[PDB]
Amino acid sequence: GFKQDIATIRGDLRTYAQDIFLAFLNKYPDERRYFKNYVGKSDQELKSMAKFGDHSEKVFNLMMEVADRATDCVPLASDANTLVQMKQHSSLTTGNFEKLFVALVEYMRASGQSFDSQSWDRFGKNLVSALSSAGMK
Ligand code: HEM
Numbered sequence: 001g002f003k004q005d006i007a008t009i010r011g012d013l014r015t016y017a018q019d020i021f022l023a024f025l026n027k028y029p030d031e032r033r034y035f036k037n038y039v040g041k042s043d044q045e046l047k048s049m050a051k052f053g054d055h056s057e058k059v060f061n062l063m064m065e066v067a068d069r070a071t072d073c074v075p076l077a078s079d080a081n082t083l084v085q086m087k088q089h090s091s092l093t094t095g096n097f098e099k100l101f102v103a104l105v106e107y108m109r110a111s112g113q114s115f116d117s118q119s120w121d122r123f124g125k126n127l128v129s130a131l132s133s134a135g136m137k
Contacts, residue, residue, distance in 0.1 A: 017060035080130035
């Protein structure tokens with residue numbers, strides 16, 4: 001289930017973090033505008049960039065912590081507040097996060113592994129709700 005899925009992802013994090021981030025950017029190519037130097041590149045070109053894998057890894061490091069600190073897929077209010085207050089996240093709305101979770105859930109469903117997809121959907125939605133309460137537009 002959800003808790004196990006956290007260990008699963010953490011066990012092979014760089015691969016999972018990149019595969020899922022790439023699924024997100026490929027599902028929604030216009031999200032690349034929030035980042036630097038992503039446009040004009042294929043998955044492999046992205047994966048060989050200096051900072052791409054390292055970035056996706058940090059994102060998923062924190063996501064897994066947030067999911068881990070959650071109860072019944074409900075994230076802590078303080079974890080949401082951190083995501084809202086991050087300088088790197090200042091121009092974002094909750095829509096950006098729900099897109100990431102849509103891509104994440106779809107990735108899980110398409111893969112071999114036995115992810116509790118519905119739980120990640122629920123967590124994604126609960127996180128979006130908490131980001132709103134924390135003041136994100
Ligand atoms: C649960 C969801 C998310 C988590 C846990 C998360 C986490 C992070 C972390 C930890 C960093 C900084 C890494 C570092 O200091 O090197 C970061 C940076 C950043 N994030 Fe997120 N993020 C999330 C969602 C998103 C989404 C959906 C977007 C945009 C569509 C986004 C846009 C950015 C941007 C533009 C940066 C700065 C990249 C850079 O400075 O090189 N984040 N995020």
